[PDB]
Ligand binder design. Structure first.
Ligand SMILES: Nc1ncnc2c1ncn2[C@@H]1O[C@H](COP(=O)(O)OP(=O)(O)O)[C@@H](O)[C@H]1O
Ligand SMILES: Nc1ncnc2c1ncn2[C@@H]1O[C@H](COP(=O)(O)OP(=O)(O)O)[C@@H](O)[C@H]1O
Lengths: 53, 53
């Protein structure tokens, strides 16, 4: 009974940990994509910008 | 829902980027052609020009 309820709490912490990691992965990747969009936009600002070469 | 609407915005930026690049390619090539036309015209001004050799 003691080992079971201890384990149940540990299991709950495990579920929470997994959910947070899943969220972090999702966020990480969208940020890489958003960073790349910004980089691409900057290069278009260069080419379709002012005067230069 | 959150990831979807984020992605939709990112997708819109992607479409815009692609359109601008397409325009830049079109413009680039016509300019090379116009530059070549100018060069050719200059050589005809030379040959069918004034006096020389
Ligand atoms: N004569 C120019 N006019 C505009 N931009 C130039 C010129 N020469 C170089 N640039 C480059 O283009 C960018 C123009 O600055 P930016 O702040 O992007 O324009 P804006 O303030 O109109 O958005 C600069 O980062 C600069 O490196
Ligand atoms: N005696 C000449 N008469 C006219 N052009 C000459 C003569 N000798 C050399 N040229 C060459 O031909 C060009 C004539 O100048 P250009 O401004 O093209 O003529 P226009 O002013 O009549 O259009 C010059 O770039 C020059 O290099």
């Amino acid at each position: 009974a003691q080992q079971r309820t201890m384990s149940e709490n540990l299991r709950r912490n495990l579920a929470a940990l997994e959910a947070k990691i899943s969220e972090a992965k999702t966020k990480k990747n969208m940020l890489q994509a958003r960073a790349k969009a910004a980089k691409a936009n900057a290069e278009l600002q260069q080419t379709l910008g002012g005067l230069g070469t």
